[PDB]
Design a protein around this ligand. Structure first.
Ligand SMILES: CC(=O)SCCNC(=O)CCNC(=O)[C@H](O)C(C)(C)COP(=O)(O)OP(=O)(O)OC[C@H]1O[C@@H](n2cnc3c(N)ncnc32)[C@H](O)[C@@H]1OP(=O)(O)O
Ligand SMILES: CC(=O)SCCNC(=O)CCNC(=O)[C@H](O)C(C)(C)COP(=O)(O)OP(=O)(O)OC[C@H]1O[C@@H](n2cnc3c(N)ncnc32)[C@H](O)[C@@H]1OP(=O)(O)O
Lengths: 450, 450
């Protein structure tokens, strides 16, 4: 099995959303604290009618149909997520509802967990499966599904929701560079979910971004080393046409790419000109911990990175800026954002991917894109995903109705025996959407279509 | 990479346990309803001092040391479990505590979830990784960790706890037969954990065993077909020296193997003599659903299987009968049970493995064992594991103290800010054991050694 990677992808996000300007107004935020300070435009959320299972059915059904793939042809199916509705019954078993109709039950894989990183873990597990002595010749399919929610406080504005499906196989338009990658894994308490009964994480910020950066530095050094072995030169920011990052909120995407540039300094690589060396050297006396901590160093770094960031990163930002944190699916939404904007320039390019998950699991990895027959082509993928069309099928909420909805969802998380109220909501969803109809007194879940 | 499978394994279970006879007395069970009816001897449980993390540290530390493997040499590390203490921070990140001392943080893998089946999923993911274009030449390491507990009622007697570690690599004494295997996956509600705040599952029994059997039938047919392709004959119970099953309780191990024999009937294979054909044919008029449901068919099947079961299955039962349900680790405890009893006869044999997890994820798969240099040898593995020694280092509790303990554990599951009471318990654990010292008010966990 050769040139294995991503053959096809498709995305779903709830059409229901709230505008960030409007929300600054609703909280008492200073003007542009969400739109500029966080970097965010719009925030998509599950109502009572939607969840990570219904979203997942939407993405799978949609990939299958539109790419003309038939369901007997899926031989591995894995789900990444951190949104747990059941502590033992995996989302993967729910998806099996879709395969029971054609009698394909010989299908490997379960759910992968770790924070905004489980999807990546799954997609690796799938690449490895196509390449393995146990491969039965069929496609793998990976789902990234999640629903990001915070309590009332300052972290609410960073929520989002989405499912993403990827079809995995040989002779792909999006090929893994097998050896080009670095991971960092650690034991930290930057972001976690110790409240069994709550939908909401416990989140430190004085580690949140520290640990993202600690991990990014380390995955970056490890990819650098592998590159010097493989290609005979030091890696710098010039050696890839694009960097795509986990996108909890856009501000952090900016900082992260800036940080790559600052790392290129540290190593004297060939993307740090005479004048950057000048601007940076004020800071070479910082301890490592000091370098994570310096608001001056950030400013300097972001400022140096701005034109590089327009060529290498801005086109990866559409979806994240318009939907919000997608946890496991966030990186892969940024990647779809890049296929949508730049697919005609991508043939023959190198896209570098950085995945992250708090508690601390992370992998930077590399992809070589190329030319290939429909349906498994960069253009065809941009066409099926239809990002533009979907951004246009949205339905705005006043920050007040958003709040009420958040309250409702707080009441149904981990609850049993209710029927979902459809009035005025069902009509808001695309024909053919899967929606939660009810939860019985034994917590069993029941889903509708159309 | 050739002849990849399991290079080394080691096991841990809490020394603290309660006797089944004694427990029949304590509940008002009829005599031998646990010892004969369930098939169980003894039941191991976590006190406040222990959990799936501390257990996991015990197995890893113990594998590393005793097999003289150094920690920089682990390049993939994955955990299977269904015991969630955090909804986003994986047990894998906690294990990273052990690797931070030698600075090895480039280590792939997260947790795999689905019920008594996540460990299997991990170990497959690891086999596939050694065989993949992305393999960096290092060992994989898989952990199965869990702590089985039920509420008061009839299911309490089936609890257990254990961690198991497996080292994965090429040129193994325990080699995967890459193509010889079948999975069945489905959407069912036989056993699940919808109570976010509870340690205890919701469990149906009129599906519990139905679904185990539905899945076993189906994984069996799929392995059969792959065998007819590969070896040119119909598979029957004679074509393997051993069948090792997921072992929630021993009664079900008996039924399951009986069922294989009944399936061998259905297909007229070469292990159903003239007289079995006679005894079975009363039942060939049953619907499929009828065949899962018939207490007469069971009796007949178990009875036909008894001498085959003594040769092919009894030696896999030591640990499960003495420790209890180990969920993800249960199958791999049964396998250790088989290495302990029969290691001198195993060189050149075929051991067939059946893994299961409710909600419905399952895989039957096949292993070819053989002769190989220490430390990676069947004899050396039987020596390091030291099952006998460990069974002897136990510490009995009166069913009354067991109950009190269960009550305590109910109070600490999902709780914060306590210090664990060590009096009279710490002294009960082996020198070098990892134990929970305290949980702070932000739910962060802190572990001791010795
Ligand atoms: C999810 C992951 O995989 S890792 C990332 C962390 N994890 C998360 O889940 C994010 C959850 N979110 C959070 O915890 C919070 O939203 C935080 C910490 C990101 C937000 O921080 P807060 O304490 O709300 O406000 P803070 O004062 O830090 O402001 C945020 C940013 O907006 C800037 N800002 C504030 N007001 C304005 C304004 N009116 N105009 C422009 N910028 C503004 C701040 O200066 C800061 O930006 P900078 O970093 O560019 O200086
Ligand atoms: C965990 C998994 O991966 S799948 C397996 C199901 N899952 C679990 O988690 C198991 C949890 N356990 C349970 O739900 C329960 O312990 C059950 C359903 C297994 C036990 O059943 P109960 O309703 O307690 O009692 P039941 O009357 O069914 O008795 C159990 C067995 O003991 C037999 N029995 C009862 N009393 C006696 C006795 N005194 N002597 C000998 N046998 C007895 C019963 O006949 C039955 O055995 P059989 O199947 O050989 O006929």
């Amino acid at each position: 099995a050769k040139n294995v990677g991503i053959l096809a992808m498709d995305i779903y996000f709830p059409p229901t959303c709230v505008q960030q300007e409007a929300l600054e107004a609703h909280d008492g935020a200073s003007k542009g604290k969400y739109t500029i300070g966080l970097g965010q435009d719009c925030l998509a959320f599950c109502t009572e009618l939607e969840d990570v299972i219904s979203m997942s059915f939407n993405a799978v059904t949609s990939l299958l149909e539109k790419y003309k793939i038939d369901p007997k042809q899926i031989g591995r199916l894995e789900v990444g997520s951190e949104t747990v509705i059941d502590k033992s019954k995996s989302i993967k078993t729910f998806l099996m509802q879709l395969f029971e109709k054609c009698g394909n039950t010989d299908v490997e894989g379960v759910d992968s967990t770790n924070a905004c990183y489980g999807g990546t873990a799954a997609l690796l597990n799938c690449v490895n499966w196509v390449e393995s002595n146990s491969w039965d010749g069929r496609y793998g399919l990976v789902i990234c599904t999640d629903s990001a929610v915070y309590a009332e406080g300052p972290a609410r504005p960073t929520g989002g929701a989405a499912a993403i499906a990827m079809l995995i196989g040989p002779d792909a338009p999006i090929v893994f560079e097998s050896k080009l990658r670095g991971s960092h894994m650690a034991h930290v308490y930057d972001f976690y979910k110790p409240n069994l009964a709550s939908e909401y994480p416990v989140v430190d910020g004085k580690l949140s971004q520290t640990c993202y950066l600690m991990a990014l530095d380390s995955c970056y050094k490890h990819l650098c080393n592998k590159f010097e072995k493989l290609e005979g030169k030091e890696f710098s920011i010039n050696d890839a046409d694009y960097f795509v990052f986990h996108s909890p909120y856009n501000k952090l995407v900016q900082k992260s790419f800036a940080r790559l540039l600052y790392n290129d300094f540290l190593r004297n690589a060939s993307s740090i000109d005479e004048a950057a060396k000048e601007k940076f050297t004020p800071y070479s006396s910082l301890s490592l911990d000091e370098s994570y901590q310096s608001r001056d160093l950030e400013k300097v770094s972001q400022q140096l990175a701005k034109t590089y960031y327009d060529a290498k990163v801005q086109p990866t930002t559409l979806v994240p800026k318009q939907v919000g944190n997608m946890y496991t699916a966030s990186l892969y939404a940024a990647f779809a954002s890049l296929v949508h904007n730049k697919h005609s320039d991508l043939a023959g390019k190198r896209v570098v991917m950085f995945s992250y998950g708090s508690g601390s699991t992370a992998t930077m990895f590399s992809l070589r894109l190329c030319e290939n027959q429909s349906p498994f082509s960069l253009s065809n993928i941009a066409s099926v995903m239809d990002v533009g069309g979907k951004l246009k099928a949205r339905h705005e909420y006043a920050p007040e109705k958003f709040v009420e909805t958040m309250k409702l969802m707080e009441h149904r998380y981990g609850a049993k025996e209710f029927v979902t109220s459809k009035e005025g909501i069902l009509d808001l969803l695309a024909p053919g959407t899967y929606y939660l109809k009810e939860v019985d007194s034994l917590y069993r879940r029941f889903y509708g279509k159309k």
